[PDB]
Amino acid sequence: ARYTGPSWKVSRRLGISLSGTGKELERRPYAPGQHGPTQRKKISEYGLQQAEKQKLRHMYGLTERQFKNTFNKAGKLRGKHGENFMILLEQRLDNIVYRLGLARTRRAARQLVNHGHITVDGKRVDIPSYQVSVGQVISVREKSAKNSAIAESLEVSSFVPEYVTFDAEKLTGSLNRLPERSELAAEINEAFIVEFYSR
Amino acid sequence: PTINQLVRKPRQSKIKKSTSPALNKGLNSFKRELTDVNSPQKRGVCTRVGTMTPKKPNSALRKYARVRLSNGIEVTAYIPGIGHNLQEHSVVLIRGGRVKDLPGVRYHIVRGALDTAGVENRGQSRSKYGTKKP
Amino acid sequence: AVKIRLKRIGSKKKPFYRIVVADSRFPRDGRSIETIGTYNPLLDPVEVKIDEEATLKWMHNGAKPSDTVRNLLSREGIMEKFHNQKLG
């Protein structure tokens, strides 16, 4: 994708499973590289807050410029800044793809929507950065329906959230209602981020 | 102060000095008069090249060149990196930056811009010191 | 002269037009006297908004349209209207 590198070392560096559920980490949770099993160090205020940012933006897999533009755009919305930012960051299309689970991870979802194997409101959308809102359907192009990657990746679904619907007979789903920081996974603080960008 | 004092004379802030005065002056041969223009870099001609003994605490020899810039100001420029191509009447491009070891130097030579051929054998920070990628 | 014409605005390969009152002399996107509508040729029905009372007024003062502004007025029914006010 945008990031074409390996996957496990990021989760290891951050001390959190991202891009999976314990896949990367339950064997050697320690940090990658020459160091990490031999020694550890106490991590500063800056480093903690940064690492929180990293846990967001490498969970979703997007450039930092794009990430901060999304931050500032979410800043307009009336509410708690980081909550609004987390929910809009979930409101990206890549999220909705991966939650429907036609592909096993964010990067695969991005690849799918990059090649345009899905269609919003019936129409084509070839960008991972589209913003879905409440009531917009999504499909599998009527042409990418039988392909083995999707057929085999729909075999797994960890749990369908309560803010999405999906009909696999159609391969058609939709966002129901915007989450509010409890529907999502909650292995983050949404405040150290705004600290790090406010200093 | 009193408000009447502040009205009889308002405040007056500080006169800022530049790190790089000679980059902030242009020239026209016609008028023969310097013209204030903010500039990042200037090119010049090395009058002299040599070594310096730096301040306490340090003792290593520091490579400098006394340059006559495009605008006529004579300036001492550090020659950073291992080895160089330069000699008398050598053309050189010059950026700002203060050698804290060395008293009379305030500017650096951009390495790799002109007759300042890049550093030998360098692999890291290559964009500094001006070596291509191999 | 004083003319009723189009002010080009928008972006490249996607024009939009404000319907404007102006002298012949002033530039195409320069100053104006009053703007009184908008225009878009891209859409299947071209989308026109006109105030029509100020427009009748500027015509009575002698602000003449362009060709395309004339035919926008006529397809909005304003040139018939202005003739009807010239009947008396």
């Binding site: - | 408000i3 502040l6 009205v7 308002p10 | -």
Partner: protein
């Protein structure tokens, strides 16, 4: 009709021929440090008969230009 500008002030000199100079004196706010400052501004009044004198309170009003400097006219003599 549209209406013209009128002011009030005090006379400083009489040496000129069929005119005076009226000094207007207003407090006003210094732009930055907020204090009120005595702003003064003198004008040349068109005195049709050399009526007024020095020390006189007076009202004037503007009109067409009448000299290099004059643009005003005597309207009343409010208080000697």
């Amino acid at each position: 009709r549209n209406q013209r500008k009128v002011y009030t002030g005090r006379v400083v000199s009489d040496k000129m021929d069929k005119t005076i100079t009226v000094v207007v004196e207003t407090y006003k706010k210094h732009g930055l440090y907020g204090k009120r400052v005595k702003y003064s501004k003198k004008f040349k009044a068109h005195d049709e008969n050399n009526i007024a004198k020095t020390g006189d309170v007076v009202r004037i009003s503007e009109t067409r230009p009448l000299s290099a400097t004059k643009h005003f006219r005597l309207l009343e003599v409010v208080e000697e």
